[PDB]
Each structure stands twice: as C-alpha cells, then as structure tokens.
Amino acid sequence: LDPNFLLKVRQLVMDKLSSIRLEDLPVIIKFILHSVTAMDTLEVISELREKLDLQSGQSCIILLFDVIKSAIRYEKTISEAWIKAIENTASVSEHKVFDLVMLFIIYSTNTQTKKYIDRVLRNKIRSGCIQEQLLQSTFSVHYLVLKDMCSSILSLAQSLLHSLDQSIISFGSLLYKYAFKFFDTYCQQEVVGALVTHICSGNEAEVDTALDVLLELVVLNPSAMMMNAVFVKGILDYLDNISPQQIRKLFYVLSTLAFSKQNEASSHIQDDMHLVIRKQLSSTVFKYKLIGIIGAVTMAGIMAADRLSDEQCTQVTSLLQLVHSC
Amino acid sequence: AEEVEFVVEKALSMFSKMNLQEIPPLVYQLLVLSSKGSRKSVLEGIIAFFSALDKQHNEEQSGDELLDVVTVPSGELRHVEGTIILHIVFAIKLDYELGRELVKHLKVGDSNNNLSPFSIALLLSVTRIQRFQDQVLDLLKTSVVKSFKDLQLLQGSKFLQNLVPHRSYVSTMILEVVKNSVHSWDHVTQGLVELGFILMDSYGPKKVSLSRMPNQHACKLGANILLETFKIHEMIRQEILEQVLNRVVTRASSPISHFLDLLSNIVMYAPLVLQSCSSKVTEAFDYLSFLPLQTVQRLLKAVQPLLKVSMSMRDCLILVLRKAMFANQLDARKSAVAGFLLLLKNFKVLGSLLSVSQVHVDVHSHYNSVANETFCLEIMDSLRRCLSQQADVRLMLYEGFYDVLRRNSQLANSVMQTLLSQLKQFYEPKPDLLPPLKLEACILTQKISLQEPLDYLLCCIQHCLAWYKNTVIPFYEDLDDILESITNRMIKSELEDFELSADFSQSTSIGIKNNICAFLVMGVCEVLIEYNFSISSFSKNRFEDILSLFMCYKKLSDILNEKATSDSLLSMKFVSSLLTALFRDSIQSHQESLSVLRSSNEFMRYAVNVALQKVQQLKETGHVSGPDGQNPEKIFQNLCDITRVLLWRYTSIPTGKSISLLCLEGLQKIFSAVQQFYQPKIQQFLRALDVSVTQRTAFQIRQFQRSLLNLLSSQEEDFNSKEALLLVTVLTSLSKLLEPSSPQFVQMLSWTSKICKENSREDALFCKSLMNLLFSLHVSYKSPVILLRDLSQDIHGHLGDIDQDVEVEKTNHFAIVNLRTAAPTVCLLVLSQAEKVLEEVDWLITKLKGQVPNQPVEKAIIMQLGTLLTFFHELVQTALPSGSCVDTLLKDLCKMYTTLTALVRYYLQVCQIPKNMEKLVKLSGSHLTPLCYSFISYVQNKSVATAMARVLRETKPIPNLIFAIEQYEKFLIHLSKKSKVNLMQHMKLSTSRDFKIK
Amino acid sequence: TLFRLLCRDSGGETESMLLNETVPQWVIDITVDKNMPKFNKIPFYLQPHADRLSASDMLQVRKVMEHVYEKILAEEKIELLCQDQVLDPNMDLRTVKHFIWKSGGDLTLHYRQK
Amino acid sequence: TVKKIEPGTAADSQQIHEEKLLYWNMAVRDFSILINLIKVFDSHPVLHVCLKYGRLFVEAFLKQCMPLLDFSFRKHREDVLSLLETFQLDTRLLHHLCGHSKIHQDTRLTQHVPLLKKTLELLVCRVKAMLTLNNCREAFWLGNLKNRDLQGEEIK
C-alpha cells in the first residue's frame, strides 16, 4: 500500500489506544510493532511508551506480554529503541510498572542488550528514577509474568550487588527480597544459593549486605527459610575468609531462624546448631574455639530472649556452662 | 608475610623435580597457603611453569611419528593442566583478591609475553564467574586486536623484520586452546563461545584501511573459534547455532555477511546439526515469511548444504513455503517464490519418501520418479500463477527460470510454455504492425510504476531457448520465428512507434512513462543483439541486423543521457565471446561479416564498456548479474578471456575515451578484482595470458614498464596524464605479486627509482602516484630514511630558506621533485612516510621498554632517529606554504620529539649512557631544537562560528610542539641526574616569544 | 533401528536419501571425507640393564634396537628385554605391553649389549 | 577567584564590561605583586608554588579573560592593550622562572616547566586569535624575549 496511507491508519489506531478494550490490545500491539521501518522505530516505540497504560485481567496482560516477547524476539533494534525511550525519560512520575517490567523482559529475551540495560539501570537508580515503591508495585501486581524469568532477575540482582554505590546496592538487595517473596519454591532456593555465594566471596561490603538480606528473609518468611537451612548451614565451612563481625551476624541469622518456630522442622536445625558449636568449642585450633564462643553466646541470647519454660531455661544454662568450661 | 613468600618460592623450585601427577594436590594446598599470604607469586609460578611445559611439549611433538623424545605425553599433560585450572578458578570463587591479581598479571599496548595457551585457557574458564566475565573477555579482545596490529606492522616494514625475531601471536594461541579443549575442557568452552561472538560483534564489517585488516582478522578469528568449538563439543553446539541464527534472522538489515558465512560453514556438518540443534533451523524457517526478500535469499543459500543431504529439513521448508505462498499477506509470497526457486534451482528430486494422538508411520515405498515429476510440476504451475504479480516477483522468476530449466531438464516444456504465454501478452503477431512490443501494457497506472520487465522476459527466453537448442535437441521453432520477427520490426521501427523526445522528464507522469519505456527498448535491443550474434553463426546479414539494433540502442541512449544507469542484459560469456571475435578473430569467412561490426567505432566502445561493467559488478558485489553470474569458476574463465583481449588490444595498437585507453582501465579493474577474489587462482590467471607467479608477473610488469616510458618520452604538452596514471596503478597492483626476496622485485624497485630520478613532469597527481609506488616498494626492501632525507633536500632547494639571507644549494636528487610538485605534493607525501618511520621506532622502544637482543635494536633505533633528524633538519628551515604543509610539519615535529622522549625514558629505566645515544642527543640540540624555534617564529610572523573554530584550532599546533620539546628536555635532566653525565651541555637555553601589537 | 539395508542396495535412489539422514558424522569422516583416524601412542622410557620415548603401537622392537645403536648390525649387537624376558625383535610394543609387561605402569624396556 | 569570573556576552551592558576589565586589571596587579616576591624569597617551596599556581592563573586568564577581550576590543582598545602589556610583564617573569628551574636542574621544579611553557605559548597564540577575530591580524607580531635571571641579569 501507500507508505503514507499506512502511517495515517496506524496513527488512527494509536490515537484510540486508551479507549479500546483489553482483549484486542495484543493484536493491535502486534500490528503496530510489525508495521514499522528503520527510521520510525525510535518514534513509534517512544509514542507507544506514553500511550500504553495497561491499567480475565491477568490473562489478557499475560497474552499482551506474550505477544511483545514474540514481537521483539527476532527484532533487536526495537528492543534498543525501547531502552533509548526509557533512558531519555527525565521525570520520576513518568516511570511506571509497565516501564520496569519491559526492562526485565528485554533482559531475559535478548542477550545482546544485557550491558546496555545494566548501564541505564545504574543511572536511573542513582538518579532516583527507579525507586523501591515502584519496584514493590511492579512485583506485587505483575509477579505472574516475572516468575517465568526469575533466573534473569536474579542474574541482574547479583550483578547489581557487586557495585560500589549504596543506592544500587540497596536496590539489588530488594530485587533479592522481592524475588524470594513472589516466586515459587525453586526460584526461592536460587535466591538463598545466590546469597550464600555472596557471603563466601571475599568482599566485605558484599558479605554484610547479603547477611542483611538473609536476616530479612528469615524474619518475613521463616517457613520458606526453614527449607533452605541446609544451604545456609553450608557457610560454616568457610569461616576462614569471614571477619569476626560477620561471624557474629552469621550466627545471629542461623540462631534466629532455628528458634523462629517450634515445629518439628525447627527442632532438627536447633539441635544441629548445637552440634556444630559443641565441636568448635572443643576444636584443637584456637581460631575455631573463639568462633564457638561467639556462636554459643549468640545462640544463648536468642534462646533466652524475653517475649520461657523451665526446660528452655536449663538449655541456655547448659550452653553457658559449656562455654565457661571450654 | 616474608616467611610465606620464602616457603612458596621453595615449593616453586620443587615443581621441576617432582612428578606431574602430584602437582594438582600441591597447587590446591599452595592456593590455600596463598590466601593468608602472597597471591601473585603463587599464580606467576604456576603459569610460568606450565607455559614452559606447553612450549617444550610442542617442540618435541613437532616431527615424524617415529621414535620421539617425549618427556610428557599430550594426553596426561592436558588432564593435569585442566585440573590445575579448575583449582585456580574455584579458589578465585572464595578469594576475590586472587582474581584481581590474575587479571592484573595478565593485563595487556604491549605484547604481554605472559600470555600463553595455559594462561589463555585459564582466563576463559575464569569467565564462569560473572564477577570477572566482562573484564576478562575484554582483556582477551584487546590482546588479539593488538596482536594483529603487531603482525600487520611487522609484515609491511622490512626494517622491523630484520630486528624483531618472530614471536607467537595470541590468535594462534587461542586456536590451539580450542584444539587442546578436546581433552574434556568443558569449563573453557563457555567462555570460548562468548569470546568468539565478541570478536564477531565488535569487529564485524560495517559497510551498512589501517584498522580494517586487524578488524577483519579479529572477526575471522571469532568465526574460527566458533566453528572449531562447534565440531568438538556437543553440549555447546546448540547454543552456537541459536546465537548465529539470532544474529542472522532479523529485519534490522545490519551487515551480517560474516555471520552468514559462519552459518554456511557450520551446516556443512549436517549430521552434527540434525542430531542436537535441529529445532532452531525449523524455527528460523517459520520466520521466513516475516523476513524481507534479501534476507530470505541469503539465509536459504547459507543453509543449502543442510537441505542437500536432509529430506526432513527440505520437507519442512516446503511446508513452510507452501503455507507462505497461500498466505494473503504480501512480502511472504515473494519469499515463497524465492524459496521455491532455490529448491527447484538446486535439487532434481523434491518431495518426501500431526494431532495429539496422531503419529507418522514409516511406509517402506520405493522412490517414484513419476510422482516426483508431478510434485515438481505442481510447484512449477504455482510459480506460473505468480507471473501476474508485482514486477519484483516477475524479475525473480525470469532470473530463476534459466537455472531451473538447466537443473530439471524435465521441466523444460513447462518453463518454455510459461515463457511463451507471457510473451504473447506483449507481442504483436501482425507482420506489419509497428512496434512489435506493447510497451503500454508493461506500465501500470494507479503514480506510474513498471509492471512487466519486458526486456528481462526476452533475456530469459533467449537464454532458455539457447539452452534448449544445444542440450535437449541432440514451440521452439515458434519462438525462433517470433524472435526473428521482433528483430526485423525493432530495426524498421523509427523510434516514433514507441511514442518516444517528447517530455523525458523525471517528475511528470508522461516523462516517467517515457523514461521507463526508453529502458525497455534499450534492454530489448541488447537481448536481440545477443540473439542475432549466435544465430546463423558469422553471417554478414545478421551482423548488419546487430549494427542496426545497436544504433537504435545508442540513439535512445544519447537522448536520455543529454536530457539527464541500468545494467546491461548481455551475459558475461557473450561479452567475452563478442570481444574475442571483435578484436582477435582472423578466420577468413568471419572477416567479411566482422568488418561490419568493426567499422562502427561506437560499437567498439560499447562492447568494451560493457565488459568494464561486468568487472565493476564483480568488485562491488562479488558476482555478475547475468546468467552463470554467481558461478566463481565460470566468472574466472571469462575474466581470463576478457583479459587476453584487453592485453592484446592495448599493447598491439597504442594511442569519448580511446579504445586502447578503455582496455587499460579494464586491465586495472581486472587485476584488482582477481587479487581481491581469486587469490589462490593467480598462478592459473597469469598462466592463461599469452615459471612461477613472480616470473610471469615480471613479464607483464616489464610490458607495462615500456608503455610508461613512451609517454614520458613525449613532450610536456602532449603528456597523456590519464594513461600515465593508469599505468602506475596497474604497476602498483602487479608489483604486489612479486616476492620481495627476488631479483624481479629488485628490478622493479630499480626501475621506479630511475624513473623518479630522471623524469620531471608537471602533473602533481602523476608525481604523487609515482612516489607512492616508489615508497611502497622501498619500505618492503629497506628503511626509507635515506630516501626521505634526500627528498627533503630537494624541497629545501626548490622552496628556498626561511632565513631570506642564505642561499641553499639545489641538490636535485630527484627530477620528479620540481618547483611545482615540491609542495604541497611531495612535502605532504614525505611527511606521511616519516610518520610511519616514527610509528615503527615507537613500536620498538615500547617492546624494549617492556622487555626489561637490545644492543642491535638500540643501535638501529638510534640510526633511524639520527637519519630522520637530518630529514626534519632540512624541513624546519624550508619556506613552506602556510597551508597544510606547516600544519603537518608541526604535528610531525611533535611526534619526533615524543619519540625522542620515549627513547630517553627507556634509558632512565635501563641506565642504572652509550656514545651513540649521546651523539643523538647532541645532534638534536644542535640541528633541530634551535631551528624549531626559528621555524615557529617564521610561521607566526609572516601572513561566523566557523571562523571562530578555525582561529582557535590554529592555536593548538605550536603550543603542542613547545610542550614536546620541554617534555623532552625535562627527561634529559632526569637522565643526566641519574646517569651522572651532563646531557644539557649540548642544549642551548630555550627561546621564548612575546607578542607586541603594531 | 534407524535404517536397515543390504550392502548392494546403497546405490539406489531411496536408500541414498535414507543413508544421508541416518549415517552419523563419525562414519562420514572416514567414508565420505576420507579422513584418517587418530594414531595412538604408548610412552616408554628406556633404561640400561645392570629417557622417555613415545612411538606408534605397531612400531617393532627392531626400531628401538637401532635407536639405541645410534645412541651408543644394530640387531646383532643390541638385545632388548622387558620384565627380565628377552624381546622378539620382530614383535611390536603393543604386544610387549599387553603380554610381557604385566604391570599397571608405563612400559619399560632395557637395552643391553648382546 | 579568577576562575569564578565569567566573560559574559557581547550583548551585555557597556559599563558591565568596563568593571570586568577593571576587575581583571586588579587581579593582574595582585598577580604581579605575588610573582615578584620570588626575587627575594627564592627557596624551593616558594618557587614550586609560583611555578604551579602561576600556570593555573594563566590557564584561568586565557579561559575567562581572553573570551571577554574578544567581545570588547573595538570600543575598549586602550584598556585591552594596557591590560595585555601589564600581564605580559608577569608572563616574562614566569619564563625566567622556568629557565631558572631548568638551569639548576631541580627535578621537583622542572616537572612543572613543560605545562607552564605550553600555556605561556598558548597565550601568545590566543592573542593572535583575538586579533584575527577582530580583523587586526597584520598588527600581530612576535619577538624573542631575552633570557634573564630571577633578579633580572641577562644570561649571555
């Protein structure tokens, strides 16, 4: 057809994007995305950003995002034009949940845009364009679409925690916390496994931040962390490259997790933590004996924490007598 | 702390004595000890030890498979090195600082002799830690690019070759890292693939010279890495093909020629592709309808080796193509036509041999040829239905029917009847009605666009008919009679019957219709010229028809040209055949008929010019437009036949442009095209013209050398500048074939030097080309610093001195350097060559500086800088024009002083001072520095926003030189303090300038 | 079973297409590409009876006899032994390692003057 | 303080340019008094400060004052010439300090000479650009200033 005629009818479709129904959005978005050329890619994508509001509701949105994934699967320039549209934005209120979801979609789909998405994401976080409440709203109302690419989110989160800016570091911590809360059991174990690798890395700032996330995950979801105690306990094998301050924090999250609940699952880790400390206290190495004193005092504080029966009171008494004797 | 270092060094010495199988346990313990103490020392010892093992193993392995002294078997050596690598990588996971030391120790611009097959393989597996993935892969990317720059610089300069002993390059190391990865190095493959794609992504062609070759070499390395990793490792070949298809299957229209070649090489191992990575090919097929036509044609040609052996892929493609053709959406039927053409152009046998609960059943039925014919006829009939579509689809079919009919001789009747039916729609059967072609039915009005390419329809008909009469004979008579009738009525048409000069405008509707109709008439005349040449053999009557057809073609061409293009429709085989008979035919019977064509000089020009177009198409696109225009073997054969005629006509008879001059232009284009594309066939190419490549090339070179002498023997006003420039261009291209270590090369250099020393032409362009040839030959022979020094003296003599009170003696070393060409032609040329000399010396100093043979290198460096000092000494006191000569000289003096500073800083590191270095310092202070100030004074004294930028830009060069001299003298104070010898006694006090306004 | 055919039926039209689909790459390398398989080597270090070497498995003892001869006609003056047993000069190291060596270490051959 | 002064635009008030020219004159006078203190206080720490911050003063002069002189050279010509002549006396003492540093071969001092010499020559070229933008290129003219000691005695 006539090139100008196609643009004119495309503009007519774009004009009423707000007043159309929800089911016809996938095909309409499919038509707009497919009927583009090289020079108008920047402008059509930019116009689509401000015009699309997205405000059977879940199913239509899922089918909407499924079309976009298929529409940009073989089109790299369209994805690059979307990031350029986001980067040019200079107002916080214009950034929206749909803006953040699309950034994760391009990251998971196209592997050639990883570095560009990362660099712009650092800039928006540093400038405050992307903020915790926007991230919280994104996960809260669109965790169905985000769940299919938890590994893509976690890879982004793990990379963000390697930075040197507290604003970026705090965002990467939240990306870990929200992934743990809103995803399934398998992606939760990846979150804990990723944190364990951060603690066993060697960077001071990385270790303390990951321990902060571990403590947070225990407090909000003790039940989900009780199933991951085996991986958290594995950090005790790498106490050589951990400072005494981080050892005390590591024993704090372990002890507060074991005594968080009183179910049969917690009784197994409760006695397992006792066994580890009883043999650090009795170790021949002086370094491990000092670690056992730190851990045993840390655990005794949580057992005796006031909110305790006589049998509970004699357990903390028994542990203290062990440290005093050793 | 120091205790840990001492015990580590002791264990490093024990490495040699103990067994290799005990090394991995020692390294694991040594890495743990490294955590609480020294980290770089442990890593350096392990890397250095295993590199020596790799080097020793390579030397002892190289040789015959007889009894060899094998200290370590290759099988166990790779196993040990593999487990050492995994221990280091695992240690880095728990020790971040260990990873930083490894990157720092292996950080690259320098050769970085620490890099080795062991250290490269160590880095590739380190990429499995995402904390180090980007910086390690960036470290490797910079290493290979810098390595290729080293190789390029060494190859082009003879001065460096005599000095620098050959060293292994990072490109070679990585290739054998892939080779050694076959010993279960699965941890290296992941980073191996990413490095290959980074090299292709970062350094792929961007067509959308100094850096293009290393970029092309870097991109080719990525293809080699990916291809070799594909063959060896099965768990990674699925990822490689998916990433390759991602880059290829796009609508972005980015340059993907390098990825398409990698895809073609990968699919050569079709059983490897079908075994694991089989779904990716089918998914790419599903997207063929959405892709543009050009992408589909190139993608399908890339996967052609896969479809040749596999039926399932061919069957899946047919299903996709059939679905795409039936789709109402356009731009998908065009791809279906392209897909069905390619399948039918290449394969004689087409065809084979579901729901949730539906399965396929292996029916054991013998192949049926009759059923195959119906399968092919069904597609052929579908393609006939596409001849009523847009002219884009019609153009594809006309180009494809010739190859379809050659492949499937059983489709000859179907194709010919299809062509006949289309021709009847535009042919007037009336014996007396003019014109014989309805050019108004070929025009679609809705804006005016072309509907039927009538000229291309007859080209396909004429070629298909020609194949029919010589392939299946040992409707055709109807076609033979129509073409004769068309020829007669086109000749007797007076160009008024075609409704043609009435408007011929590029904007009005009638002008657009007239312009298109002009192209069709010329296109038809070319095809009919080709038809009448072959038919009736060499007959005078038919050749008179050709001449009459040419006049109709030429007359319409002149009208369109002066009121103001398109490719010629002659096949390259016909052009080669036409030229051979038109210039090199002496058979008695043919001479009578050929005298008709030879009598028209305009026809002579037309025949040669079309041959130049065919060669030009090869250079631009890599293939020729006409039939058999994508067959490299047949293009090369025509190139040899055309070259023989062009060589003969130019040399046998000397001299718009003349015929002999046009043959010279074609010769230059062919020589460039042959070397660019048919590199391995150069010996065959030179053989076909009428010993080795150097001996045959020298025979042609001497043959063009005599031609240049004839023009130079003529007068100044009669000097044919256009021909002389072409001869030097031909000589330059031919001289690229001579071996530098041969007497033939020496004769070529001696002849070029003699021509420059004796011939004085007033053509600036001729002098620039001649000097460029002389310098190109000289640099590959020896250092041109002595040549540069003599040329600078000529410029000084012709242009005078800035002192205005002294008289400079005219050396007249070279006659080509006269008062007109001395500036800005020769001066800018010699300055660019001295720039390359300084880049060579800067490269040597950088290597020596990082190295700590030194005494031979140091003497050569000082000898180069000593001679180049006298070259600059002549230029700084020459009255150069205020243009770019002064700008380039000031920039080059800054480079000279930067190079001197780099040499001085080298001795600061070494001298804890030889006589040659001292004399170089003395010479710089007595012959360059005081005269640089005089030149600065000379330049400055004599004389919207764009002007604002210009005036501020001119304030940069002189202060840049002042900093360079002061930086040079700053480090000479350091050297005099360190070496206890006063080097500042040779340097006078710096001279400063002040401004004062009149 | 991917495909079954007789030896004489490979030249048929239907069998050739089926062979292209089913024949694996490791058979294509030798039958179509005409490549040559690897040559395995055994590393053996000679020790004088009272220097590691690797060679082809089908290398005869006579070749090891003459290598020592240049180090110090060759067959008549030098005798090789392994595990205190004299070695047949026409015999190869592949047979030596499998039969006489009777050990899990690298093959050791001892050279002594006849 | 010098870095904070802005050249303004050619469309600004005429008296505003006059006060900036007067302000630049006072800055140069303070520079003249400060730099001249090295004749009596000629120790290494004093010369190092003069060598380092003397360059920075010239760097700020040709980045701030020089664009200002481009706008106002026709209406204000005697002031611009007098300002340049007064500043030229300061730059001459900067050149002699550079020569003094190299003559005594003080490594801590000669490591500031190359960048000061570049900026001092950059000022001479920048004055030529100002004249060229004002169609007075033929009025520009160089000369080799004599090499002097810190006290002022000619070195010859």
Side-chain angles (χ1 to χ4, degrees), chain B residues 660-678:
Chain B
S660 305
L661 189 58
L662 277 179
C663 297
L664 192 50
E665 310 184 29
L667 278 173
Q668 185 254 307
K669 286 186 178 180
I670 285 166
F671 285 144
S672 311
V674 162
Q675 295 176 10
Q676 178 179 1
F677 296 106
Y678 310 103

Side-chain angles (χ1 to χ4, degrees), chain D residues 129-145:
Chain D
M130 183 210 56
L131 283 186
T132 301
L133 300 153
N134 281 328
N135 297 322
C136 300
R137 202 214 190 83
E138 309 84 39
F140 195 74
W141 182 26
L142 282 73
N144 290 352
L145 61 94

Side-chain angles (χ1 to χ4, degrees), chain B residues 79 120 202 271 297 311 481 492 596 707 805 811 822 843 878 990:
Chain B
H79 161 280
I120 286 175
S202 303
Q297 262 161 338
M311 288 179 326
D481 282 307
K492 279 169 320 185
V596 176
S707 297
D805 314 307
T811 43
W843 192 72
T878 311
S990 173

Side-chain angles (χ1 to χ4, degrees), chain B residues 271-295:
Chain B
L272 296 193
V273 178
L274 291 155
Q275 183 214 110
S276 64
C277 64
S278 174
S279 47
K280 326 271 173 173
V281 192
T282 58
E283 302 174 327
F285 286 166
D286 293 329
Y287 206 70
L288 271 187
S289 50
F290 304 130
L291 291 178
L293 191 86
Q294 183 62 255
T295 306

Side-chain angles (χ1 to χ4, degrees), chain A residues 2 36 74-75 158 203 241, chain B residues 94 96 130 251 287 447:
Chain A
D2 187 74
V36 297
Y74 277 129
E75 322 294 358
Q158 173 204 350
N203 298 98
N241 61 6
Chain B
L94 304 154
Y96 176 70
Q130 161 197 32
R251 288 171 34 115
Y287 206 70
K447 315 169 185 179

